[PDB]
Amino acid sequence: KVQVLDFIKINPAGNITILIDNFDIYDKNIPKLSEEIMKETNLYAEQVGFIKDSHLQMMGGEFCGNASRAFASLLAFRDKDFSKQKNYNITCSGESKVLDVDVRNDGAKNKFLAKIKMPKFLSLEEINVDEYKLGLVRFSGINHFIFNIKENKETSFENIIDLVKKYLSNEEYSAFGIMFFDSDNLSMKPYVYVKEVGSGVYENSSASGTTALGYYLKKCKNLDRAKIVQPNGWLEYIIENDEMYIDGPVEIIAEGKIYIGK
Amino acid sequence: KVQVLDFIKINPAGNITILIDNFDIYDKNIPKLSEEIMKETNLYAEQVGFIKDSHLQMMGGEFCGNASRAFASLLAFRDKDFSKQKNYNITCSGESKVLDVDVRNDAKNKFLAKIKMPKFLSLEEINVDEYKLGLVRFSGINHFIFNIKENKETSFENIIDLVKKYLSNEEYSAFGIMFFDSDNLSMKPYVYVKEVGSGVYENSSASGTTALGYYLKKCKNLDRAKIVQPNGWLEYIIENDEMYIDGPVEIIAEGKIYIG
């Protein structure tokens, strides 16, 4: 049997997102479904969501700032009343608060700029393990470590990953991120690890990571706003009225039907 | 039936230690016995350790720099070859490495004992809520550092409830909070054990004094300082990438104790 699903492919700052539509968000087939979708042998993406009215049910039931930005940019794309700017109220899995996204046109009708209010950090640390100084911005769900390659000495990105892993060996964590940060170019190579899957992936973008880097830059350099270049995209962290926002580009790539093997 | 044990009550920097001599260090009743000895209705102590030939076995198999300092000062007290200084190589539970203690005279029952202390795993500076806390993490304990003067007005209990919140997601056996006064270079060591669900403001803490020493080496580049504690004082000394604790030890009493 062949399953046909409405899809929208989107590039939110490089974190490619497939947004399935007109589907049951509670379907237990969501995880395996999104798994086959994301393959390079299929509609290749880095995140998969499931739209319904104004709610975004991610594949993992978690909150994603980029997939939420992609979603809000779809409403504008599909809203006949949208002109050049509009605020779109949306809800997202893993976030009880209603998210008000400021969606602006970025030139074309498929290009957008989406500013979303990102969760607040629980704590901000500066750990000194081994011979390296590392940042840490603990969140509800993700621990985001920072690594100023410049301030630190020579090392493989792998070494800093095994060092952070050994650091959390006594800490019940489900996933951590490490932001290998270059201060000369304000660039950042986000990395993420998960225990359940037991692997690591270098991502093209990271809304939450950019938030972490922003928190660590406001404490260490008093930068309230800046654009963070990332592998295949860029984001901008914004601290206004003691609150964190992420702004960045969003491009509607494709629209149509996908054929999955049940 | 009543147990008769030989005891030496000592005052290591205020961390009252009863050392029980001529006893099976492998006895499984040691826990209960120590519990009963430490009561204020009995001999009274903050730590209890049992002694074989140059070996010191804590009640909980832990390492205690102060109790080990007391043990070394006892050997000097009972050694007629001891003068203004002698080095005694002792061992302590929870620490395989042999420990060279520099025991000196301070009276015949007053001493000064310098012992090498465990190395830290990582040093940090958390910024949770609106507080800046230091955190030195050792093997088995995590010593927080709360600079009262550099932080804002707060209750001690507040910082305790806060630190607990920080470790909610972390698996730990116990944590100490070194409430630090930068002006007088004094601190009020506190210690919580989730394994026993209770907190105690100690008269002194050796491990805590190393934590603050590590924290003061990174922040102010201080190698050695005297840290006054509620009822005692210890001196941390960092030399050649090693941590030491010096301080006063007084032999209080010798004799026999009776336990049922």
Author numbering:
A (entry chain B): 4 to 265
B (entry chain A): 4 to 109, 111 to 264
Authors' description from the paper:
In this work, we set out to find the physiological substrate of the cofactor-independent racemase (predicted DapF, FN1732) from F. nucleatum ATCC 25586, and were surprised to find that this enzyme functions as a histidine racemase (HisR). Here, we characterize this enzyme as a histidine racemase (HisR), and found that catalytic turnover is ∼10,000× faster with L-histidine than with L,L-lanthionine. The rate of HisR was not affected by buffer composition (PO4 or Tris), ions (SO42−, Mg2+, and EDTA), or the PLP inhibitor hydroxylamine; however, the enzyme activity was hindered by iodoacetamide and Hg2+, which are known inhibitors of enzymes with catalytic thiols. These results, along with a sequence alignment of HisR with other cofactor-independent racemase and epimerase enzymes, suggested that HisR operates via a two-base mechanism using cysteine residues 67 and 209. The DapF-like fold is an overall α+β structure, in which the monomer unit is composed of two structurally equivalent N-terminal and C-terminal domains.
To confirm this, we used site-directed mutagenesis to generate HisR mutants C67S and C209S. Catalytic turnover of these mutants was greatly reduced with D- and L-histidine compared to the WT enzyme, as expected. The position of the loops above the active site spanning from residues 42 to 49 (N-terminal domain) and 197 to 206 (C-terminal domain) in HisR more closely match the conformation of the open C. glutamicum structure than the substrate-bound, closed form. CntK and other enzymes with a DapF-like fold are typically functional as homodimers, and HisR appears to maintain this feature.
